[PDB]
């Protein structure tokens, strides 16, 4: 009954890292990129880099156990999984907060992993494909301010890796959440914009626009509120198909398809459990194409697409709150 | 909230506008024009062509942008709205503020007037619309200072324009809701919700009987509405950019419009094809006033973002190349300070205005030192750089086109400067404490008799303003007026404790202390920020003539003997830890 | 009296509601006392405030109780836990939305005794399964994950806390008043506890002790009893019970024989497992008690299935001192002293099982075992 | 002194008056005055990078009209 998909063992309050690693492993082009960086580093060494090495070791380890299970399925009975002990240890050196066995944010550890990959890429490119994070997860935002007195426009350029959107007002769909993010908003009253053309505090309209789009659109759901901090257990209506044309500087025909969801189970924000649900994109592996795998640490299940989306629906109240949505470019 | 003390560095008489003009009101009986300036001053001008100097009076009681003015009661009363969240009643014949209405919670942007009923409505960014009867407002006295308020409701966003009809039976509101809301001022009941605009509305007009409404919006379209049918009966698109000002004739057949595109057009309402380009202004048009002495109007007064107010003749509209090329009459305007730099001593400021002139100011004495002409502003900053560091103790805002200096409890007393370092001939001096004593010099409560701080004096005409931090103006007065009976009683209630401590109790503020490390170059010490390097030099000398034998180092650089520790920590140190100094024999 | 306090709140809660903060401060001070009359009144002052006041003062009541449970006093923690249980039973709907604060006590289990930990899990479990609404399902799956990450904890104390909490939850989960999907869900929880405690013998012993007390003192669904009895009976047979036909073999430094039989048979393979430790034999007694109770519950007091365990011999050495007590080494006596304790504990548990029989020869076997306990106990002092 | 924007948990933009020399502790304290979220529970994301405590706004090249994003920690394990 064991599926040919390697899970990850919980080393003690590390399902935040396991859910991220399973999403990153199945992310299109991430395994290919990390292999390429390892080749450059290994050749450079044979002629700071530990995180790239640790990622390579984990990817190979997952690959070999998957290979061995296919050849000899009788060798494994209870569960097929491996331990990211080396990768976890590297995170403790890079970030001291990971020392111990406490519970951590899944988006934060993904940010730490992706942030240090780009630093290694920049250092290697400085010493010298190389644009792993930038082509995959990094896009460009255009933030426009319109003073309501003089009607002058000011613009800013800012990069982004994830789109943090609200889930509540203070049913709703993902379209509403991105509207609350990038549609025009009026800042008034206590939050007046200081126009340097008027030399005065004025009301203004702020709108965000997508200029450059990455290969992977990460949506960070603010499933938490303040009054006092609490968790919002009601999800949005997450669609399988997403088009960011409404909020783009140029008209585009490029749509994105959902391929990974990171969920959080718990009634509070200070503790809980993280699980990942990933869509599957040798001959026996093709029977899982178009299906969703749920990664509950070392246990891997499989779910049909129509059943998985119903599990995400707010109508059937789920105990696992979606927290990160990953969309890949079609 | 916390009370802040602020004052304006200016001349006694500001004859000309130092910023743009937001509103215009014309008095046909006395031939007088009123300009609501962005420099917080209302001015009266004689529109008679004979007078080479049209200036009459300045109505200076606001502390921020004056947004709207209405001239009511046959030119005897003026109502004004301002960004300081207050509505004020003025004596338009003498030119003094009679009362202040503090019902609004945000900027007050619009004033509507009904001539027949003497009814005035004030609306603003707090989404409120209040109705006022001028006769009740003008009849207020010291004992009779209570008024019943009738406020319209229903508007879900900030109002930018307001209008009423001649008969006082229809009131229309324009806001960023992109819709027009109409009430009946008599019953305060909602009538209709006009829709069709796709942007903010800044201009509104109504006819005598209040059955048709003209509205101009930031979307660049003028819409004529029918209140009977509750629909838009015509739309006019004659402007490239948003329409900000509207004027109509007594027959309500020709509309005069101007906006951000700087062009003014005369369009016939019966047929939009007949359009006349009156002029092309040098700045975006904020407001226009029609000369209604004759029909058709002979001329129009135009207020823009510049300090100059121009009058354009309208002879030949009914008789693209503009009709006019030069304004018939011109009201002169001043210069607005647009750039500001506080020098390293925290006592002098270099400013650059809209005329590119650069001036040198003394904050402590609250006066201008010298005009530097059209010298490059950045170069003048470099030519006046000094290797000294004084902590920030004031803030500068240029919202009125003038120098306003704000003093806050957090950092007013952070700058201790020796008398020798300043121009006063050495005892230690606190710049913030000295300025506060000079601002409140005429206040009898500060007398124990000597007056002031005994070193300098701000000009007597300096407007001293007390207001809440990010709030409302508690009390405004001139420096020389603190001795009056009314002002002194008001000062006792508004002046906060942190100003009483220094100006009345004569207490001395804290002395900031900077600890530092002395180590031999190859024992933590705490000293005053003003301590010179010589004092540290002689301390090491006694530990082991002192000037000659000992050289102190920081970051492998030599320290000037006359330089102070405060300057060393700021420039040379370039580190986020306790300042370390290294001593070695010469 | 209680009735005066009950009547006071019942008809004049309108005026008392204005001062809920003042009443709760009075209630909290009363609970710090040492007399039961004062403590009982202070607990009542908490319960009546929760019953009659509004939502905001109810959160104050729960927050005040959580502070008492985290205070450290044995008297306060015991009393406040009783108040929490009463509030859950009385008004589960009001306590339903206060579960976040009650869940917060789990962060302070270090200064809470194991007896109070069991009670804290009982109120949490009975509150999570009080209703079937969507609010309960969030807490139900929340409680499962808290224990799931305690069962797998490397820290031994939290591993034991996970066993106590998971056995406690299964009691409410399988409590008889149960559909198949609930029956397999509680069964999966027990399979989780069994797997986690397999390695550690003392942790495995706690699982048997806690789960046996649940079978004895609680009435559960028959289907739940069906699975537990099946898995225990076969595992116990495979673990300890061995055939008497096959002679023992090994590298034992002692002669190994079958001892203490009565009157082709089964026997308890006690000694070789004890020697190999130089299921663990240390869990033989608590495990058999679990087997006996599970068999008894399904058959309603009938126990023919474990008849052979009473009279079966025990694989033991020549336990009589053959004038070699002084020559015995320290390792040998220490091993053999544990041999006597495990043999005595097995016989004591055997007596517990068949002490309620009626048949004459059935009773004589028990008395013979009772005689064996006494005489073998005398050998212990040697 | 400049003005920056912070998009809060509801997506609603607020404004702060900051110095280029202000530390991330100071910025987080300003948000607490406007939002009520304790600084230790605050995560500030600028241009895809989380602002680290102990550094200043000049380290990240944060200038006028720069937008920060405020999120909390959803701890799991
Ligand atoms: Zn502006």
Closest Cα in chain A, distance from residue D4 (Å): 9
DSSP annotation string for B357-395: -EEEEETTTTEEEEE--S--HHHHHHHT--S-------E
Pairing of strands A81-82, A7-8: parallel
Q: Taking Cα atoms as reference points, which of B109, B32, B35, B31 lies closest to residue B303? A: B35
Give the chain A residue whose CA is nearest to the CA of B84.
A201
Residue D26 is assigned to a structural domain of this protein: yes
Give the chain A residue whose CA is nearest to the CA of C134.
A317
- From the CA of A202, how far away is ligand 1's center (Å)? 6
- Cβ-based contacts of C153 with chain A (< 8 Å): 12
Rounded to 5 degrees, what are φ and ψ at A202? -135, 160
- Cβ-based contacts of A113 with chain D (< 8 Å): none
- Cβ-based contacts of D33 with chain A (< 8 Å): none
Cα–Cα distances (Å) from A136 to A20, A118, A277, B113, in that order, read: 15, 11, 20, 61
Q: Taking Cα atoms as reference points, which of B127, B89, B95, B132 lies closest to residue B108? A: B127
Omega before B296 cis (within 30°)?
A: yes
Across the interface, whether the CB atoms of D45 and A164 are under 8 A apart is answered yes
Assess contact for D7 and D68: CB atoms under 8 A: yes
| Interchain touch C–B (≥3 Cβ pairs closer than 8 Å) | no
- Cβ-based contacts of A233 with chain C (< 8 Å): 138
User: Count of alpha carbons within 13 Å of C75, Cβ hemisphere only?
Assistant: 13
- Cβ-based contacts of A317 with chain C (< 8 Å): 134, 137-138
CA dist B441 and B436 (Å) reads 8
Across the interface, whether the CB atoms of A319 and C154 are under 8 A apart is answered no
Tokens 């002002």, residue?
A: B487
- For B125, which of A150, A200, A203 is closest by C-beta distance? A203
What burial letters (b/e) apply to D7-33, b meaning 16+ CB within 10 Å? bbbbbebbbbebeeebbbeebbebbee
- From the CA of A89, how far away is ligand 1's center (Å)? 52
CA dist B468 and B393 (Å) reads 18
Pairing of strands B222-226, B212-217: antiparallel
CA dist A218 and A329 (Å) reads 11
- For A154, which of D65, D72, D76 is closest by C-beta distance? D65
- Cβ-based contacts of A206 with chain D (< 8 Å): 5, 13
What burial letters (b/e) apply to D58-67, b meaning 16+ CB within 10 Å? eebebeebbb
User: Best interface-test mutation with B: which of A195, A200, A202 has the largest number of B CBs within 10 A?
Assistant: A200
Give me the resolution in angstroms, 1 decimal: 2.8
Assess contact for B496 and B4: CB atoms under 8 A: no
* The two three-digit tokens of residue C129, written as one number: 């399964």
CA dist B283 and B333 (Å) reads 13
Residue D42 is assigned to a structural domain of this protein: yes
Give the chain A residue whose CA is nearest to the CA of D69.
A164
Across the interface, whether the CB atoms of A186 and B83 are under 8 A apart is answered no
* The two three-digit tokens of residue A263, written as one number: 């969920």
Q: Is A104 on the interface with D (CB under 8 A)?
A: yes
Give the chain A residue whose CA is nearest to the CA of D66.
A156
Write down the number of H helices and E strands in chain D. 1, 6
Assess contact for B324 and B256: CB atoms under 8 A: no
Q: How many residues does chain B have?
A: 586
| Interchain touch A–D (≥3 Cβ pairs closer than 8 Å) | yes
Residue D66 is assigned to a structural domain of this protein: yes
Report how this structure was experimentally obtained. Answer: cryo-EM
- From the CA of C82, how far away is ligand 1's center (Å)? 65
Write a three-state SS string for B314-339: CCCCCCCCCCCCCCCEEECECCCEEE
* The two three-digit tokens of residue A257, written as one number: 């398809």
Q: Is D61 on the interface with A (CB under 8 A)?
A: no
CA dist B412 and B1 (Å) reads 17
Q: Is A194 on the interface with D (CB under 8 A)?
A: yes
User: Best interface-test mutation with A: which of D31, D46, D77 has the largest number of A CBs within 10 A?
Assistant: D77
Across the interface, whether the CB atoms of D74 and A224 are under 8 A apart is answered yes
- From the CA of A193, how far away is ligand 1's center (Å)? 9
- Cβ-based contacts of A200 with chain B (< 8 Å): 65, 83, 399
Assess contact for B266 and B222: CB atoms under 8 A: no
Q: How many residues does chain D have?
A: 77
What burial letters (b/e) apply to B480-507, b meaning 16+ CB within 10 Å? bbbeeeebbebbeebbeebbebbbbeee
Return the H-helix or E-strand segment holding A143: strand A139-147
The partner residues of A40 in beta bridges, in order of sequence, read none
Neighbours of C216 (CB within 10 A): 14
Q: Taking Cα atoms as reference points, which of B541, B440, B561 lies closest to residue B498? A: B440
* Count of the separate structural domains present in chain D: 1
Residues 131-160 of A with CB under 8 A from B: 148, 150-151
- Cβ-based contacts of D73 with chain A (< 8 Å): 104-105, 108, 269
CA dist C197 and A292 (Å) reads 32
- Cβ-based contacts of C137 with chain A (< 8 Å): 317, 319
Assess contact for B583 and B547: CB atoms under 8 A: no
Give the chain B residue whose CA is nearest to the CA of A190.
B470
Closest Cα in chain C, distance from residue A267 (Å): 7
Cα–Cα distances (Å) from C287 to B429, C156, C194, C336, in that order, read: 87, 21, 12, 22
How many angstroms separate the first and last alpha carbons of chain B? 56
Q: Taking Cα atoms as reference points, which of A186, A203, A191 lies closest to residue A149? A: A203
Domain that holds residue D44: 2-71
* The two three-digit tokens of residue C18, written as one number: 């204005």
Residue D36 is assigned to a structural domain of this protein: yes
User: Best interface-test mutation with A: which of C138, C151, C159, C191 has the largest number of A CBs within 10 A?
Assistant: C138
Give the chain A residue whose CA is nearest to the CA of B200.
A148
Residues 118-147 of A with CB under 8 A from D: 138, 143, 145
Assess contact for B540 and B583: CB atoms under 8 A: yes
- For D76, which of A115, A161, A273 is closest by C-beta distance? A273
CA dist C8 and D9 (Å) reads 45
Assess contact for A122 and D49: CB atoms under 8 A: no
- From the CA of B560, how far away is ligand 1's center (Å)? 47
CATH of the domain at D38: 3.10.20.90
Q: Determine the 3-state secondary structure of B40 from DSSP.
A: coil
Across the interface, whether the CB atoms of D48 and A271 are under 8 A apart is answered no
Assess contact for A218 and A325: CB atoms under 8 A: yes
Neighbours of A268 (CB within 10 A): 18
In this complex, the chains that touch A, judged by 3 or more CB pairs closer than 8 A, are B, C, D
Tokens 């509104």, residue?
A: B204
Residue D76 is assigned to a structural domain of this protein: no
């Amino acid at each position: 009954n064991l599926l040919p998909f390697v899970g990850l063992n919980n080393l003690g309050n590390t399902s935040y890292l396991n859910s991220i690693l399973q999403v990153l492993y199945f992310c299109p082009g991430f395994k290919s990129g990390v292999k390429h960086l390892f080749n450059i580093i290994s050749r450079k060494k044979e002629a700071s880099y530990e995180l790239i090495c640790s990622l390579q070791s984990l990817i190979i380890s997952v690959e070999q156990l998957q290979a061995s299970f296919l050849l000899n399925p009788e060798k494994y009975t209870d569960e097929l999984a491996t331990q990211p002990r080396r990768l976890l240890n590297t995170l403790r050196e890079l970030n001291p907060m990971y020392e111990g066995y406490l519970q951590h944010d899944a988006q934060e550890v993904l940010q730490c992993i992706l942030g240090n990959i780009q630093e290694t890429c920049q250092l290697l490119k400085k010493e010298e494909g190389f644009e792993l994070v930038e082509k995959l997860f990094q896009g460009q935002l255009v933030l426009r301010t319109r003073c309501l007195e003089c009607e002058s426009l000011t613009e800013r350029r800012e990069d982004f890796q994830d789109i943090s959107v609200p889930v509540q007002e203070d049913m709703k769909t993902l379209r509403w959440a991105i509207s609350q993010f990038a549609s025009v908003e009026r800042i008034v009253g206590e939050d007046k914009y200081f126009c340097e053309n008027c030399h005065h505090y004025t009301e203004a309209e702020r709108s965000l626009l997508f200029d450059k789009m990455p290969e992977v659109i990460t949506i960070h759901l603010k499933c938490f509120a303040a009054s006092g901090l609490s968790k919002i257990n009601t999800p949005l209506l997450t669609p399988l198909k997403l088009s960011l044309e409404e909020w783009s500087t140029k008209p585009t025909n490029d749509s994105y398809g959902l391929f990974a969801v990171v969920m959080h189970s718990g009634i509070t924000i200070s503790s809980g459990h993280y699980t990942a649900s990933v869509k599957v994109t040798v001959q026996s592996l093709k029977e899982y194409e178009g299906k969703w795998l749920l990664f509950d640490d070392s246990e891997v299940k499989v779910t049909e697409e129509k059943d998985f989306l119903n599990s995400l629906s707010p109508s059937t109240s789920p105990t696992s709150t979606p927290y990160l949505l990953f969309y890949k470019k079609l | 909230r916390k009370v802040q003390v602020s004052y304006v560095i200016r001349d006694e008489v500001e004859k000309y506008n130092r910023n743009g003009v937001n509103a215009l009101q014309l008095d046909p009986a006395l031939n007088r024009l009123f300009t609501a300036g962005r420099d917080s001053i209302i001015r009266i001008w004689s529109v008679n062509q004979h007078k080479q100097d049209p200036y009459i009076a300045s109505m200076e009681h606001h502390t921020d942008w004056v947004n709207d003015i209405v001239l009511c009661c046959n030119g005897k009363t003026l109502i004004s709205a301002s960004s300081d969240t207050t509505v004020k009643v003025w004596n338009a014949h003498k030119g003094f503020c009679m009362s202040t209405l503090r019902t609004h919670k945000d900027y007050v942007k619009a004033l509507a007037y009904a001539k027949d009923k003497e009814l005035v409505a004030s609306a603003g960014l707090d989404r409120q619309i209040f109705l006022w009867d001028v006769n009740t407002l003008t009849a207020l006295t010291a004992s009779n200072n209570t008024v019943t308020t009738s406020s319209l409701s229903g508007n879900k966003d900030s109002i930018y324009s307001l209008a009423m009809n001649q008969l006082g039976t229809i009131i229309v509101s324009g806001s960023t809701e992109k819709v027009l809301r109409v009430w009946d001022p008599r019953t305060c009941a909602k009538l209709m919700k006009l829709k069709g605009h796709t942007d903010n509305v800044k201009a509104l007009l109504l006819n005598r009987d209040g059955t048709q409404c003209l509205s101009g919006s930031s979307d660049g379209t003028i819409r004529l509405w029918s209140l009977g049918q509750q629909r838009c009966i015509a739309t006019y698109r004659v402007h490239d950019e948003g329409v900000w000002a509207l004027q109509v004739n007594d027959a309500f057949t020709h509309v005069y419009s101007g906006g951000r595109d700087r062009k003014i057009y005369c369009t016939d309402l019966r047929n939009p094809d007949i359009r006349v380009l009156i002029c092309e202004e040098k700045a975006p048009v904020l407001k226009m006033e029609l000369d209604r002495s004759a029909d058709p109007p002979p001329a129009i007064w135009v207020a823009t973002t510049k300090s100059t107010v121009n009058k354009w003749t309208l002879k030949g509209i009914h008789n693209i190349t503009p009709l006019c090329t030069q304004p018939d009459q011109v009201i002169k305007g001043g210069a607005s300070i647009i750039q500001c730099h506080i020098l390293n001593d925290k006592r002098h400021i270099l400013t650059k205005d809209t005329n590119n002139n650069v001036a040198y100011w003394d904050v402590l004495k609250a006066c201008k030192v010298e005009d530097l002409g059209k010298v490059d502003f950045e170069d003048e900053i470099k030519k006046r750089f000094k290797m000294v560091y004084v902590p920030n103790w004031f803030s500068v805002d240029l919202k009125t086109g003038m120098l306003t200096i704000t003093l806050d409890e957090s950092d007013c007393f952070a700058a201790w400067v020796s008398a020798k370092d300043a121009g006063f001939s050495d005892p230690k001096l606190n710049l913030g404490g000295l300025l506060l004593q000079a601002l409140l010099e005429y206040w009898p409560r500060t007398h124990v008799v000597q007056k002031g701080n005994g070193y300098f004096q701000v000009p007597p005409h300096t407007p001293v303003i007390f207001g809440e931090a990010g709030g409302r103006t508690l009390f405004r007065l001139l420096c020389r007026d603190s001795g009056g009976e009314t002002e002194s009683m008001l000062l006792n209630e508004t002046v906060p404790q942190w100003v009483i401590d220094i100006t009345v109790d004569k207490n001395m503020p804290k002395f900031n202390k900077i600890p530092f490390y002395l180590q031999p170059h190859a024992d933590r010490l705490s000293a005053s920020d003003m301590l010179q390097v010589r004092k540290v030099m002689e301390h090491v000398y006694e530990k082991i003539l002192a000037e000659e034998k000992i050289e102190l180092l920081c970051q492998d650089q030599v320290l000037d003997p006359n330089m102070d520790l405060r300057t060393v920590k700021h420039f040379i140190w370039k580190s986020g830890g306790d300042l370390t100094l290294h001593y070695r024999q010469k | 009296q209680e009735q005066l306090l009950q009547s006071t709140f019942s008809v004049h809660y309108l005026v008392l509601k204005d001062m809920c903060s003042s009443i709760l401060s009075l209630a909290q001070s009363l609970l710090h006392s040492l007399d039961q009359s004062i403590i009982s009144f202070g607990s009542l002052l908490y319960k009546y405030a929760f019953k009659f006041f509004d939502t905001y003062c109810q959160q104050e009541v729960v927050g005040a109780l959580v502070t008492h449970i985290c205070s450290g006093n044995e008297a306060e923690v015991d009393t406040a836990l009783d108040v929490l249980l009463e509030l859950v039973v009385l008004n589960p709907s009001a306590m339903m939305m206060n579960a976040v604060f009650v869940k917060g006590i789990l962060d302070y289990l270090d200064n809470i005794s194991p007896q109070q930990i069991r009670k804290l899990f009982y109120v949490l479990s009975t509150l999570a399964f009080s209703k079937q609404n969507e609010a309960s399902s969030h807490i139900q799956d929340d409680m499962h994950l808290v224990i799931r990450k305690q069962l797998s904890s490397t820290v031994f104390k939290y591993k034991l806390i996970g066993i106590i909490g998971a056995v406690t939850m299964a009691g409410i989960m399988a409590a008889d008043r149960l559909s198949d999907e609930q029956c397999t869900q509680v069964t999966s929880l027990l399979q989780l506890v069994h797997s986690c405690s397999e390695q550690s013998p003392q942790a495995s012993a706690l699982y048997y002790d806690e789960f046996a007390n649940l079978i004895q003192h609680e009435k559960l669904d028959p289907k739940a009893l069906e699975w537990v009895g099946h898995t225990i009976c076969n595992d116990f047979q495979d673990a300890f019970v061995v055939d008497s036909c096959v002679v023992p073999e090994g590298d034992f430094p002692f002669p190994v024989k079958a001892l203490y039989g009565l009157e082709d048979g089964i026997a308890i393979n006690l000694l070789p497992l004890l020697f190999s430790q130089d299921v663990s034999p240390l869990c033989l007694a608590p495990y058999f008690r679990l087997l006996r109770l599970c068999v008894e519950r399904q058959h309603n007091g009938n126990l023919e299935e474990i008849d052979g365990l009473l009279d079966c011999p025990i694989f033991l050495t020549d336990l009589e001192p053959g004038e070699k007590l002084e020559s015995m080494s320290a390792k040998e006596r220490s091993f053999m002293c544990s041999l006597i304790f495990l043999t005595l504990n097995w016989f004591r548990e055997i007596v517990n099982a068949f002490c309620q029989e009626t048949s004459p020869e059935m009773k004589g076997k028990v008395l013979t075992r009772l005689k064996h306990i006494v005489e073998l106990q005398i050998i212990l002092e040697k | 002194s400049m003005q920056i924007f912070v998009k809060t948990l509801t997506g609603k933009t607020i404004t702060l008056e900051v110095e280029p020399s202000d530390t991330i502790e100071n910025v987080k304290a300003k948000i607490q005055d406007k939002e009520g979220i304790p600084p230790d529970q605050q995560r500030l994301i600028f241009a895809g990078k989380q602002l680290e405590d102990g550094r200043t706004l000049s380290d990240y090249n944060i200038q006028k009209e720069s937008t920060l994003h405020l999120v909390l920690r959803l701890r799991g394990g």
